[PDB]
Amino acid sequence: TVAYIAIGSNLASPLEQVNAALKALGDIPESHILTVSSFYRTPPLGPQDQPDYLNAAVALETSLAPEELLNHTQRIELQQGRVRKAERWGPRTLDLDIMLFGNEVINTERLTVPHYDMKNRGAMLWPLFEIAPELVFPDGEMLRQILHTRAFDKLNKW
Numbered sequence: 001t002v003a004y005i006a007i008g009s010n011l012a013s014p015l016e017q018v019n020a021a022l023k024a025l026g027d028i029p030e031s032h033i034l035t036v037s038s039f040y041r042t043p044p045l046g047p048q049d050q051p052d053y054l055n056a057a058v059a060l061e062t063s064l065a066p067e068e069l070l071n072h073t074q075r076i077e078l079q080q081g082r083v084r085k086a087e088r089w090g091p092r093t094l095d096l097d098i099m100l101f102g103n104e105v106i107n108t109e110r111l112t113v114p115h116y117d118m119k120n121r122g123a124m125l126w127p128l129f130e131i132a133p134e135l136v137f138p139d140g141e142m143l144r145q146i147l148h149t150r151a152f153d154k155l156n157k158w
């Protein structure tokens with residue numbers, strides 16, 4: 001099954017964390033990376049104080065069940081999602097979300113797939129469109145259609 005995973009980091013200098021996460025994704029059992037999108041920059045929410053967000057999309061071929069994959073992405077967030085500062089570990093700065101899982105619709109306590117808000121997020125749709133321009137959602141909506149309808153501004157690469 002082809003799973004699409006959204007990667008985000010709002011660390012001030014996020015490249016090393018993102019690469020560590022990408023490597024870890026490739027190490028997930030019964031799985032392997034098919035392709036990785038470019039890295040996209042989005043300004044912080046509200047207050048300009050915060051760092052920009054680095055966003056990307058990964059296509060992962062996997063024979064794991066959806067919630068088994070979530071266990072692994074959540075493990076990676078616990079293991080690599082926080083960065084040590086001088087005398088303290090920082091908060092979680094890495095976010096791994098399952099955008100799509102094959103052509104499956106999932107609605108459990110732990111999982112909502114397709115991701116509940118992805119159709120509102122250029123930070124998700126643009127990197128996904130780069131790696132899967134012909135993508136069709138479970139309900140028959142096309143990724144191209146969503147982008148065409150909303151006419152989101154394009155995001156700058158990192």
Ligand SMILES: Nc1ncnc2c1ncn2[C@@H]1O[C@H](COP(=O)(O)CP(=O)(O)OP(=O)(O)O)[C@@H](O)[C@H]1O
Binds near residue numbers: 099110112113114115
């Ligand atoms: N498609 C999906 N991918 C990942 N987690 C998901 C998910 N659908 C539901 N969840 C649930 O989302 C819960 C909260 O995850 P968080 O990472 O804290 C939300 P977030 O990603 O910061 O915001 P967002 O969901 O608005 O993108 C998890 O405990 C997980 O069970």
Ligand SMILES: [Cl-]
Binds near residue numbers: 155156157
């Ligand atoms: Cl660009």
Ligand SMILES: [Mg+2]
Binds near residue numbers: 095097
């Ligand atoms: Mg998220």
Ligand SMILES: [Mg+2]
Binds near residue numbers: 095096097
């Ligand atoms: Mg998340």
